[PDB]
Amino acid sequence: MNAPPAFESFLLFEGEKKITINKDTKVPNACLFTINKEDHTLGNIIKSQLLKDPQVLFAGYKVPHPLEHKIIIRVQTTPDYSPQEAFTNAITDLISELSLLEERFRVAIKDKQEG
Amino acid sequence: PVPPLSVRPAVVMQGSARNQDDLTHKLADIVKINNQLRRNEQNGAAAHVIA
Amino acid sequence: YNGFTGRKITSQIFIGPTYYQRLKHMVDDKIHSRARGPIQILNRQPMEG
RNA sequence: UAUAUACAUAAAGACCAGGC
């Protein structure tokens, strides 16, 4: 009777922003992103792309609680590199990876069939 | 003393009429016999039946 | 392998098919909440059950 | 046009079974 709807995990209702950016006062150049209606699929890709960036000192995510679906990503970069720039370059670098993987998987298919 | 209706509520049965608490029966058995004891002493004053 | 992060789990885990029973006891029938409801006749206190 | 349909009733007790 209290079971939440199945669709409630990936669907946003009125008023919920997808992303919420809040600066972090503990630290200089630290920012904390809040992603609604996402899980470890999306959060883990980005964290692991941020740690390749040598100008990123810290990156990590957590699901605060499993029953509510949101991600919280802290990022701390070096001075004169903004933590919002770090998080955008991460997303464009995956897109430039996954667009290279979808093209290389199509070539191996045609090679595989009758070849 | 006869405690009030609150202390011995009736039972309202939607099927048939009402039922009465234990006290209301236990108090009925006293008023019956107390009254039989009213008449004997007042009328015949029969000594051995009163006992 | 870990399900969330993909990495192996250091210690090896013991898996096998095992036979479980579901019990007459479910949470939907044990749940209860009370705010200013029915009240007993004699005591004017909340009902039982 | 105005005004109205406002809540109460399913008793109690007994034994039996189970839960922690």
Swiss-Prot record, chain A:
Signal peptide positions (record): none
Key words of the record: Acetylation, DNA-directed RNA polymerase, Nucleus, Transcription
A Pfam family of this chain: RNA_pol_L_2
Cited InterPro entries: RBP11, RBP11-like, RBP11-like_dimer, RNA_pol_Rpb11_13-16kDa_CS, Rpo11-like
Main location: nucleus
Transmembrane segments: none
Keyword GTP-binding in annotation: no
Modified residues (N-acetylmethionine): 1
Gene Ontology molecular functions: DNA binding; DNA-directed RNA polymerase activity; protein dimerization activity
A GO BP entry: transcription by RNA polymerase II
GO (cellular component) term, any one: RNA polymerase II, core complex
Cell location: Nucleus
Function description: DNA-dependent RNA polymerase catalyzes the transcription of DNA into RNA using the four ribonucleoside triphosphates as substrates. Component of RNA polymerase II which synthesizes mRNA precursors and many functional non-coding RNAs. Pol II is the central component of the basal RNA polymerase II transcription machinery. It is composed of mobile elements that move relative to each other. POLR2J/RPB11 is part of the core element with the central large cleft.
Family membership: Belongs to the archaeal Rpo11/eukaryotic RPB11/RPC19 RNA polymerase subunit family.
Subunit text: Component of the RNA polymerase II (Pol II) core complex consisting of 12 subunits: a ten-subunit catalytic core composed of POLR2A/RPB1, POLR2B/RPB2, POLR2C/RPB3, POLR2I/RPB9, POLR2J/RPB11, POLR2E/RPABC1, POLR2F/RPABC2, POLR2H/RPABC3, POLR2K/RPABC4 and POLR2L/RPABC5 and a mobile stalk composed of two subunits POLR2D/RPB4 and POLR2G/RPB7, protruding from the core and functioning primarily in transcription initiation. Part of Pol II(G) complex, in which Pol II core associates with an additional subunit POLR2M; unlike conventional Pol II, Pol II(G) functions as a transcriptional repressor.
Name used for this protein in its record: DNA-directed RNA polymerase II subunit RPB11
Curated annotation (Swiss-Prot), chain C:
Modification sites for N6-methyllysine: 24
Protein localization: Nucleus
Function: Catalytic core component of RNA polymerase II (Pol II), a DNA-dependent RNA polymerase which synthesizes mRNA precursors and many functional non-coding RNAs using the four ribonucleoside triphosphates as substrates. Pol II-mediated transcription cycle proceeds through transcription initiation, transcription elongation and transcription termination stages.
Subunit structure as annotated in this protein's UniProt entry: Component of the RNA polymerase II (Pol II) core complex consisting of 12 subunits: a ten-subunit catalytic core composed of POLR2A/RPB1, POLR2B/RPB2, POLR2C/RPB3, POLR2I/RPB9, POLR2J/RPB11, POLR2E/RPABC1, POLR2F/RPABC2, POLR2H/RPABC3, POLR2K/RPABC4 and POLR2L/RPABC5 and a mobile stalk composed of two subunits POLR2D/RPB4 and POLR2G/RPB7, protruding from the core and functioning primarily in transcription initiation. Part of Pol II(G) complex, in which Pol II core associates with an additional subunit POLR2M; unlike conventional Pol II, Pol II(G) functions as a transcriptional repressor.
Similarity field: Belongs to the RNA polymerase beta chain family.
Name of the featured protein: DNA-directed RNA polymerase II subunit RPB2
Organism annotation: Bos taurus
Name of the gene encoding the protein in the UniProt record: POLR2B
